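Dear all,

This email documents one entry for the complex benchmark we are building for the journal club exercise. For each entry we list the sequence lines for every component of the assembly. Then comes the predicted three-dimensional structure of the complex as a token string, followed by one or two observations. Please use this as the template for your own entries, and keep the labels exactly as they appear.
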Amino acid sequence: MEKEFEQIDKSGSWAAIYQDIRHEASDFPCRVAKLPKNKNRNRYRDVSPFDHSRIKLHQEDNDYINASLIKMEEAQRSYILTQGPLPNTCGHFWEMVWEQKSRGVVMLNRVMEKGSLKCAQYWPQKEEKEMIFEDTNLKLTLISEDIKSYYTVRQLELENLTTQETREILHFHYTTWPDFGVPESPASFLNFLFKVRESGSLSPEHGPVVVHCSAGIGRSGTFCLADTCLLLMDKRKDPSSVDIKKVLLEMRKFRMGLIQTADQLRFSYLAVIEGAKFIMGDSSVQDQWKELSHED
Ligand SMILES: O=C1C[C@@H](c2ccc(C[C@H](NS(=O)(=O)c3cccc(C(F)(F)F)c3)c3nc(-c4ccccc4)c[nH]3)cc2)S(=O)(=O)N1
């Protein structure tokens, strides 16, 4: 993997590889996403879910939400990639989290980046100020949070008002990954990813973990691509079979535009190559990552 990485650098073909990937990416319809009544449910006109993999709300009125089920069959894991909820779709977002039985939500953007709204405040910032979604009859309360230097983990309690039932939702919020950019290093990224893994939110006993940035394809796609590649290196009886570009192309069958820059793909490689050390058996990399991420 680093052999090919190595050879792309000198060749200066990171952009060429990435542009080929764009050209070879699946191109399915998004007829439901482009319906006129669903226009105010899509933050970006050019980022829609394919009709075949979109998530359907269980409400008998409008079942649309800009979100896609990415089902990696060989890796044995599923992810729900969605956009940053909009002021009017926050009820939709939690309805989906509830109906799909998700246990965790991975946020990789910030509500405001470089002076621009990229996502609505869809979770309670203060314990004493819970939120109520009346269109979906749901309640959401912040129970506790763990604030690190570049990311925060929050315990939330979503409650189905109708049935009076509640569930614990773990929110993993990466707060230092810039738009159209990359994490500060593989170390920080991996430390964060394993934090989500160690929590149980990605277990097969739960519904698809929900991942998102602003548009839900760039940072979200980088996160998911790296996680899946490492899942496969650990499965296959040989981590050298894993072709990231082939894996990316497979993921783009479920959602368009996964990985938005040539540099993000190059970070992907860097993340997987580094992550590989842990899969192999190195029982010291994880802690080094944490101590290298300066999470305090
Ligand atoms: O790393 C990232 C990039 C973010 C991202 C990715 C795509 C969009 C869709 C954005 N959609 S719009 O609706 O704001 C937009 C902007 C330009 C053209 C366009 C056509 F539909 F193609 F005409 C739509 C969009 N922005 C551009 C950029 C931005 C800067 C420099 C170059 C290109 C092109 N499309 C928004 C956020 S993410 O949160 O998914 N993670």
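Observations: Residues 1-296 form a domain with the Protein-Tyrosine Phosphatase; Chain A fold (CATH 3.90.190.10). The pocket of IZ1 is lined by residues 44-47, 109, 179-180, 213-219, 260 (CB under 6 Å).
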